[PDB]
UniProtKB/Swiss-Prot annotation, chain B:
<feature type="active site">
    <location>
        <position position="234"/>
    </location>
</feature>
<dbReference type="InterPro" id="IPR027519">
    <property type="entry name" value="KFase_ver/fungi-typ"/>
</dbReference>
<dbReference type="InterPro" id="IPR013094">
    <property type="entry name" value="AB_hydrolase_3"/>
</dbReference>
<dbReference type="Pfam" id="PF07859">
    <property type="entry name" value="Abhydrolase_3"/>
</dbReference>
<dbReference type="GO" id="GO:0019441">
    <property type="term" value="P:L-tryptophan catabolic process to kynurenine"/>
</dbReference>
<comment type="subunit">
    <text>Homodimer.</text>
</comment>
<dbReference type="GO" id="GO:0034354">
    <property type="term" value="P:'de novo' NAD biosynthetic process from L-tryptophan"/>
</dbReference>
<feature type="active site">
    <location>
        <position position="202"/>
    </location>
</feature>
<comment type="similarity">
    <text>Belongs to the kynurenine formamidase family.</text>
</comment>
<keyword id="KW-0823">Tryptophan catabolism</keyword>
<dbReference type="GO" id="GO:0030307">
    <property type="term" value="P:positive regulation of cell growth"/>
</dbReference>
<dbReference type="GO" id="GO:0009435">
    <property type="term" value="P:NAD biosynthetic process"/>
</dbReference>
<comment type="pathway">
    <text>Amino-acid degradation; L-tryptophan degradation via kynurenine pathway; L-kynurenine from L-tryptophan: step 2/2.</text>
</comment>
<keyword id="KW-0378">Hydrolase</keyword>
<dbReference type="InterPro" id="IPR029058">
    <property type="entry name" value="AB_hydrolase_fold"/>
</dbReference>
<protein>
    <recommendedName>
        <fullName>Kynurenine formamidase</fullName>
        <ecNumber>3.5.1.9</ecNumber>
    </recommendedName>
</protein>
<feature type="short sequence motif" description="HGGXW">
    <location>
        <begin position="27"/>
        <end position="31"/>
    </location>
</feature>
Length: 261, 252
């Protein structure tokens, strides 16, 4: 009996903080895995951020074809890039093995979308050089069907040009300089192109016109690069509320549910 | 006689017990190409019909006279008249418009109809208003939205724009930067879902037309969806199975 992952010890990477919003059952065909954002640093953003959205999806999913989980990762300033990402990768890898997830749809908001973007860029390193975390990334690419990137951060460089004030958090996640971020679109797009084609991954980009913390600049800089490399993607722009309303928004739930098909 | 070519309307999937949505297609052809016809969408529509296991969709494809014999906005007005008559004759309650090339231009022009007040609208414009009242979704495939941008990018396309705009492209009334405020009114007043589609393999149009439209949409905070892919050359886009899937999955 119980009240759903097999807790491990020690649990350095916070696998035990994984939430289940909708468990696997007889008719389950697709998995949704959520990654919360919060600027690498905000302890108020948790895997429970997506509770409302997941529950709206669970309602619409009248045949129970969807299972849904949300992962945790350690925060800056103590854990810095790419170690927060590697926690999420580690935790997702364990979850897939434990539940036998054959495929997955990744949903991320803010820095969670950043992590998914970083995973999509993993082919930047050849198999001869890949670290254990990078090999796990390759492993996830092999099973990802779609990603949904909600009001994401893709270019640290462009983020600091637009928002010098955001140094207050980026200096914590990138303590040796943001130039240490390896996944600038203009540098890694050729590898993301290879990954989406090789693994047949569908990319969905979502942004809110009302997002007070990020303008459309990040989105448009990504789109411009995606276009230049002729990567297929889908974009959805709407009034989906404030930055932290987007991952609770019923129109976002609908968008995700309707596009898992 | 059948001046506007209503009798050339094709039915791809007639109404059924179960029909809830209508799809109406408008072929393109740069205003003038007689090789584009309502059959352009036969393949796509038959694929959607097959996807539509429960017969919730009906589908029709319309015709309109070509330039140089007729010029803007009279080609549009044929399409409008023909759709209006079809809607009346079949009792179509809602509609999903799908346009390719200038067929998408037409749909865009319909979306900008509130540029004229009710007191000033012509009969064709009043018909456009009546379409706005029942349109649920539009799917704009590799369209032309700005004549000004089109000749900036391709001065050589004067060879067909001079046929449809014989007194000059300045007579085009629907430049996005000019009419976006009215499109904004329409989309909100009526709850219309806009989908923009372009092919990376389109040899006739780069992404400029699409990007110029997006920039303007974003400036007015108009909701829309975009789908970019390799969907073939310009006149193959409307036959691509990925387009068929995109449309069907988005009528929900
Ligand atoms: Cl008139």
């Amino acid at each position: 009996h119980h009240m759903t992952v097999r807790a491990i010890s020690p649990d350095i990477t916070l696998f035990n903080k994984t939430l289940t919003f909708q468990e696997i059952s007889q008719n389950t065909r697709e998995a949704v895995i959520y990654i919360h954002g919060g600027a690498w640093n905000d302890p108020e953003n948790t895997p429970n951020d997506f509770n409302q959205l997941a529950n709206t999806i669970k309602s619409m999913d009248t045949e129970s074809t969807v299972c849904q989980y949300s992962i945790e990762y350690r925060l800056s300033p103590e854990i810095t890039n790419p170690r927060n990402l590697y926690d999420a990768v580690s935790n997702i890898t364990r979850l897939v093995k434990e539940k036998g997830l054959t495929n997955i749809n990744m949903v991320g908001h803010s820095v969670g979308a950043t992590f998914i973007w970083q995973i999509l860029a993993a082919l930047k390193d050849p198999q001869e050089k890949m670290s254990e975390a990078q090999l796990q990334m390759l492993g996830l690419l092999q099973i990802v069907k779609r990603v949904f990137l909600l009001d994401g951060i893709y270019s640290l460089k462009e983020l600091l040009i637009e928002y010098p004030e955001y140094d207050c958090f980026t200096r914590l996640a990138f303590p040796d300089g943001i130039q240490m971020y390896e996944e600038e679109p203009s540098r890694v797009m050729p590898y993301v192109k290879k990954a989406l084609s090789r693994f047949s991954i569908d990319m969905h980009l979502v942004h809110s016109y009302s997002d007070e913390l990020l303008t459309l600049r990040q989105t448009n800089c990504l789109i411009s690069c995606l276009q230049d490399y002729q990567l297929s993607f889908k974009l959805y722009l709407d009034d989906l509320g404030l930055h932290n309303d987007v991952y609770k928004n019923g129109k976002v739930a609908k968008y995700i549910f309707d596009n898992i098909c």
